């Protein structure tokens, strides 16, 4: 699992 | 919000693919491995994510990077929110991330276990039992005549 998925 | 990023010092280690560093200059401030950092979540309404900077490196594929070892608050646990908004918990959650995602530099300390302390009573305010109100303690002063038995409550009620 990964928290930040912004781009 | 970070836009100008610059490495500080020569590279500590080299992969031939990554170049690790010990300190970075981001805008005005200087950040080094071991410092802690705040990050805005994808949902801006959510509280700030907090993490410890465990590594700093420049990547041929990703650019200027760091590894974030997250903290977590009580709301992220079985506990629910904690009594202190400044309270954090260690947790095993990691993430590689761009340095431009760092919101600010924050201070996180470890509070070692403590003892019971001096368990004595204390007071701060004075309660007007007639009007049901709190004020700063009255400064009624005794004379040199009645100091041996002065009662500030006896003096006021007279
Ligand atoms: Zn990690």
Author numbering:
A (entry chain F): 18 to 24
B (entry chain A): 724 to 842, 859 to 897
Text taken from the publication that reported this structure:
In mammals, DNA methylation is stably propagated by DNA methyltransferase 1 (DNMT1) during mitotic division. DNMT1 contains a C-terminal methyltransferase (MTase) domain, preceded by several regulatory domains including a replication-foci-targeting sequence (RFTS), a CXXC zinc finger domain and a pair of bromo-adjacent homology (BAH) domains. Here, we report that DNA methyltransferase 1 (DNMT1) specifically ‘recognizes’ H4K20me3 via its first bromo-adjacent-homology domain (DNMT1BAH1). Here, we show that DNMT1 directly recognizes H4K20me3 through the regulatory domain BAH1, which in turn mediates the chromatin association and enzymatic activation of DNMT1.
To understand the structural basis for the DNMT1BAH1–H4K20me3 interaction, we determined the crystal structure of the BAH1 domain of bovine DNMT1 (bDNMT1BAH1), which shares ~94% sequence identity with hDNMT1BAH1, in complex with the H414–25K20me3 peptide at 2.65 Å resolution. The structure of bDNMT1BAH1 reveals a twisted β-barrel resembling hDNMT1BAH1. The H414–25K20me3 peptide extends along one end of the β-barrel, with the side chain of H4K20me3 inserted into a pocket formed by Y772, W793, D799, and E816 of bDNMT1BAH1 (boxed). Flanking the H414–25K20me3 peptide, the side chains of bDNMT1BAH1 D765 and E818 each form a bidentate hydrogen bond with the backbone amides of H4, and the backbone of bDNMT1BAH1 D765 is further hydrogen bonded to the side chain of H4 R23. Distinct from the typical Kme3 readout that depends on aromatic or other hydrophobic residues only, the BAH1 domain recognizes H4K20me3 via a pocket formed by mixed aromatic and acidic residues. Sequence alignment of the DNMT1 BAH1 domain across different species revealed that the H4K20me2/3-binding sites fall into the most conserved regions. Mutation of hDNMT1BAH1 at or near the corresponding H4K20me3-binding pocket residues (D768A, Y775A, E819A, and E821A) significantly reduced its binding affinity for the H414–25K20me3 or H414–25K20me2 peptide, while introduction of a W796A mutation largely abolishes the hDNMT1BAH1–H414–25K20me3 or hDNMT1BAH1–H414–25K20me2 binding. Strikingly, the H4K20me3 binding by DNMT1BAH1 causes displacement of the autoinhibitory linker, which frees DNMT1 from the linker-mediated autoinhibition and leads to allosteric stimulation of DNMT1, reminiscent of what was previously observed for the DNMT1RFTS–H3K9me3Ub interaction. In the DNA-free state of DNMT1, the H4K20me3-binding site is occluded by the C-terminal portion of the autoinhibitory linker, which likely reinforces the intramolecular RFTS-linker-MTase association, resulting in a direct link between the H4K20me3 binding and enzymatic activation of DNMT1.
